[PDB]
């Protein structure tokens, strides 16, 4: 079979990829790149009023995750946007106008979740692009299911994308994996071709 | 021996694990999961009064690591809680009531420490669980030694744990690796089974 050198090379390549945002596709929805969440429509952040900050003993305020964590890379357990119930929206102005060719959703891995279950994960969802103004009914680009038994990061390629470019897209979460009280969104990424 | 495919698979599995908090066990002491440090008893943070922040030239304040870094994942050099001398405590309300089956301690790796030594690492330590209120003398669950010549992350399994659950545990550091002035704690994790 293979040689000690071959192995090294395979491993170098694997770690190279690993270090390129795991999956090696640019992310036009990454916040630090110039992307942002511009609206959650009527999505009500599920506030637990649980994380009390307090100085010298005096209660200052409760922390909760901004819906903008969804465009940030820290994906430790609890670093997700939670909203009430199994349905919710996020409108993201991508850092650039692109032809969207794919998206990535990821969730905390099972082995780091209590009981190896992740009922708060999104399930069925869809992606709408908007040609300018977000208040239009937007154009649907794809509908997919986050697979609770799949890998934590999963990438969904659109079927025969038009060559229509967009800079505003909406992550519309339609179902969850059964958690009765909220859905928690860890990270959402948007890949595609920049205009020319 | 092995095939090019076998190798890929091994590497995929290794990186899968790598990405599941390195060791693939949930962490009931991770802060973002809902855990917190609730007391350092009489542990005096070793304040160096060294990290001066300052705007337009005017001294605002000295930074020092909160004892709460111990429940945060950023483990670059200097991201540790320091306390005076070789003895110190941290009481952690875990994010959940569990039967504690193991803990993890880790420290900055040698190769990133000056002179490849880490005298400020903890050495002998122990874990006490509290059945409700932390002010009791607590029940000892285990006593271990962080091995300065071992790997940076090390996991200690308790010997014949009772099936007693707890939500408050205490990291009690008994010795260090010889640094005459402080001990620096990078990250402390607590693993176990959630109640049912």
């Amino acid at each position: 079979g293979v040689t000690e050198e071959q192995v090294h090379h395979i491993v170098k390549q694997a770690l190279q990829r690993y270090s390129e945002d795991r999956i090696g596709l640019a992310d036009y929805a990454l916040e630090s790149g110039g992307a942002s969440v511009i609206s959650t429509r009527c999505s009500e952040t599920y506030e637990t009023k649980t994380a009390l900050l307090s100085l010298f003993g005096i209660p200052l305020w409760y922390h909760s995750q901004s819906p903008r964590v969804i465009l940030q890379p820290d994906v430790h357990p609890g670093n997700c946007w939670a909203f009430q119930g199994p349905q919710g929206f996020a409108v993201v102005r991508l850092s650039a106008r692109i032809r969207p060719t794919a998206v990535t959703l990821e969730h905390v891995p099972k082995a780091l979740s209590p009981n190896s279950t992740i009922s708060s994960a999104p399930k069925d969802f869809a992606i709408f692009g908007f040609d300018e103004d977000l208040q239009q009914e937007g154009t649907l680009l794809g509908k997919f299911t986050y697979d609770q038994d799949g890998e934590p990061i999963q990438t969904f390629h659109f079927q025969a994308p038009t060559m229509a470019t967009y800079q505003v897209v909406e992550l519309r979460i339609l179902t969850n994996w059964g958690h009765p009280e909220y859905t928690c969104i860890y990270r959402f990424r948007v890949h595609g071709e920049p205009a020319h | 021996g092995v095939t090019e495919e076998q190798v890929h698979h091994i590497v995929k599995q290794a990186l899968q694990r790598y990405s599941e908090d390195r060791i693939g066990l949930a962490d009931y002491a991770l802060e973002s999961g809902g855990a917190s440090v609730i007391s350092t008893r009489c542990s005096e943070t070793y304040e160096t009064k060294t990290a001066l922040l300052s705007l337009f030239g005017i001294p605002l304040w000295y930074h020092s690591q909160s004892p709460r870094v111990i429940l945060q994942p950023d483990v670059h050099p200097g991201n540790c809680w320091a306390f005076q001398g070789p003895q110190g405590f941290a009481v952690v309300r875990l994010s959940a009531r569990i039967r504690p089956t193991a803990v993890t301690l880790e420290h900055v790796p040698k190769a990133l420490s000056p002179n490849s030594t880490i005298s400020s690492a903890p050495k002998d330590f122990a874990i006490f669980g509290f059945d409700e209120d932390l002010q009791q003398e607590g029940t000892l669950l285990g006593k271990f030694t962080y091995d300065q010549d071992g790997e940076p992350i090390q996991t200690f399994h308790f010997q014949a744990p009772t099936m007693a659950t707890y939500q408050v545990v205490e990291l009690r550091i008994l010795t260090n690796w010889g640094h005459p002035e402080y001990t620096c704690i990078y990250r402390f994790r607590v693993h176990g089974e959630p109640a049912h």
Binding site: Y46, L52, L55, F56, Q65 | S32, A35, C42, P67
Partner: peptide, 24 residues
């Protein structure tokens, strides 16, 4: 270590989960 708690008596913000877990 008697009834001590220096974290509680400092310039350091303290964080604690008064309800259950945060969402995750």
């Amino acid at each position: 270590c008697t009834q001590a708690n220096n974290f509680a008596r400092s310039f350091y913000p303290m964080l604690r989960y008064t309800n259950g877990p945060p969402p995750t």
